[PDB]
Design an enzyme around this catalytic site. Structure first.
Site, PDB file in Angstrom:
ATOM      1  N   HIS A  32       1.147  -1.129  -0.054  1.00  0.00           N
ATOM      2  CA  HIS A  32       0.352   0.116   0.154  1.00  0.00           C
ATOM      3  C   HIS A  32       0.541   1.444  -0.042  1.00  0.00           C
ATOM      4  CE1 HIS A  32      -3.950  -2.091   0.825  1.00  0.00           C
ATOM      5  NE2 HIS A  32      -2.665  -2.207   2.527  1.00  0.00           N
ATOM      6  N   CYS A  75      -4.558   5.010  -1.677  1.00  0.00           N
ATOM      7  CA  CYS A  75      -4.227   4.503  -2.405  1.00  0.00           C
ATOM      8  C   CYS A  75      -4.070   3.952  -3.395  1.00  0.00           C
ATOM      9  CB  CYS A  75      -3.861   2.778  -1.253  1.00  0.00           C
ATOM     10  SG  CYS A  75      -3.354   1.802  -1.688  1.00  0.00           S
ATOM     11  N   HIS A  88      -5.056   0.665  -4.946  1.00  0.00           N
ATOM     12  CA  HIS A  88      -5.960  -0.082  -4.624  1.00  0.00           C
ATOM     13  C   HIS A  88      -6.983   1.405  -4.805  1.00  0.00           C
ATOM     14  CE1 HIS A  88      -4.171  -2.472  -2.230  1.00  0.00           C
ATOM     15  NE2 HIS A  88      -4.253  -3.393  -3.343  1.00  0.00           N
ATOM     16  N   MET A 137      -9.827   2.470  -1.460  1.00  0.00           N
ATOM     17  CA  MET A 137      -8.966   2.578  -0.318  1.00  0.00           C
ATOM     18  C   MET A 137      -8.881   3.853  -0.785  1.00  0.00           C
ATOM     19  SD  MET A 137      -5.851   0.447   1.078  1.00  0.00           S
ATOM     20  CE  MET A 137      -5.265   1.334   2.189  1.00  0.00           C
TER      21      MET A 137
HETATM   22 CU   LIG Z   1      -3.356   0.024  -0.992  1.00  0.00          CU
END
Ligand SMILES: [Cu+2]
Length: 99
Positions: free
Chosen positions: A37, A84, A87, A92
């Site tokens: 991440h 992120c 994602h 996210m």
């Molecule tokens: Cu992530």
């Protein structure tokens, strides 16, 4: 304030994802599950005059292992949207308000 990168059940989320802080308060992002991440501040969705570079990871940078942290302190008041990069589509994303 501590923010988990990935929930304990493996969900691709910031925990918590929406929070408020006082100026100069440090935010500690902690790699938790579903890594890698990163934490990227949207340049078009942060307070005017703030340098996204001073508070964000690069989109190419990554926290690869459990327990790795990214720490940032925000000073300018207003709303900051972050995400992120790998994602983002999965949801996210988050938002911190400096009041
Ligand atoms: Cu992530």
């Amino acid at each position: 304030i501590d923010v988990l990168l990935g929930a304990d059940d493996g969900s691709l989320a910031f925990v918590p994802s929406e929070f408020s802080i006082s100026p100069g308060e440090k935010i500690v992002f902690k790699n938790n599950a579903g890594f890698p991440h990163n934490i990227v501040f949207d340049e078009d969705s942060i307070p005017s005059g703030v340098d996204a570079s001073k508070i964000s990871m690069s989109e190419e940078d990554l926290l690869n292992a459990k327990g790795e942290t990214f720490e940032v302190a925000l000073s300018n008041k207003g709303e900051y949207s972050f995400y992120c990069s790998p994602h983002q589509g999965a949801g996210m994303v988050g938002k911190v308000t400096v009041n």
